[PDB]
Amino acid sequence: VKPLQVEPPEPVVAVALGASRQLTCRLACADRGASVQWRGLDTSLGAVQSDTGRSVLTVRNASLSAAGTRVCVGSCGGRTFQHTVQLLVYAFPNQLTVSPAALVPGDPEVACTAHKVTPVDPNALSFSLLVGGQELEGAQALGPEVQEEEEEPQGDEDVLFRVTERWRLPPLGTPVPPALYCQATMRLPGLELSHRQAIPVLHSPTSPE
Ligand SMILES: *[C@H]1O[C@H](CO)[C@@H](O)[C@H](O)[C@H]1NC(C)=O
């Protein structure tokens, strides 16, 4: 026995903004008084149904308000059990922007900004400058977080973040690569999302042999 179970078990459960997830808390009770309760604050765009798997917590079209700790407490026979789970709501960037859009082997730097993101802290969001399938050696860094304000007519509502990462560029090299790549990776409990965005390297350094 347990005798209180939650499906899924994971202590941390990640859900994409606007998606859905349902947690089923079950209690094996030999007695009459058996009672199950879901708490924390409640919300998410979630609900609670009982008697068809004890009590299921369903988060629908998740919002950032969904995130937070949820607790299922089950009472049975003057005895009480629990299971605590953290809902982690996140938003992977829907666009990646590279400045300059293309790289004449000139030289300066390059910036890559991810749009509409959460979370934005390292350990959960990293950027990479790639040449082929490996990170460009000699590239530096510095990443700024920004908040975005929007809500244009006849549909929806809300606010997220725009993170940019800049890189002072090394010489590059011979033979100049056809393109460099910016990659934004998000690593959450159980998952890893990634976005690779091409940045064309202009085959211009001419003039010699
Ligand atoms: C919940 O909110 C999201 C974004 O604000 C929206 O796309 C979705 O349709 C909403 N769900 C409902 C039932 O309104």
Three-class HEC string of the chain: CCCEEEECCCCEEEEECCCCEEEEEEECCCCCCCEEEEECCCCCCEEEEECCCCEEEEECCCCHHHCEEEEEEEEECCEEEEEEEEEEEEECCCCEEEECCCECCCCCEEEEEEEEEECCCCCCCEEEEEECCEECCCCCCCCCEEEEEECCCCCCCEEEEEEEEEEECCCCCCCCCCEEEEEEEEEECCEEEEEEEEEEECCCCCCCC
Q: Tokens 């899924």 map to which residue?
A: 8
Asked if 62 contacts 15 with a C-beta cutoff of 8 angstroms, the reply is yes
Task: Specify the CATH number for the domain of residue 62.
Answer: 2.60.40.10
Distance CA 114, CA 163 (A): 5
Distance CA 72, CA 84 (A): 7
Distance 56 CA to ligand 1 centre (A): 21
Among the candidates 90, 122, 141, a domain finishes at: 90
The tally of domains found in the chain comes to 2
The residues facing 73 across adjacent strands are 37, 82
* φ/ψ of residue 77, rounded to 5: 55, 45
Mark whether 4 and 99 lie in a shared domain: no
Among the candidates 57, 90, 123, a domain finishes at: 90
Distance 43 CA to ligand 1 centre (A): 14
Name the experimental technique.
Answer: X-ray
Pocket test residue of 60, 61, 64 for ligand 1, highest count of atoms within 8 A of CB:
61
Distance 144 CA to ligand 1 centre (A): 29
Mark whether 66 and 97 lie in a shared domain: no
Domain containing 5 equals 1-90
Distance CA 69, CA 178 (A): 47
Q: Resolution in Å, one decimal, please.
A: 2.2
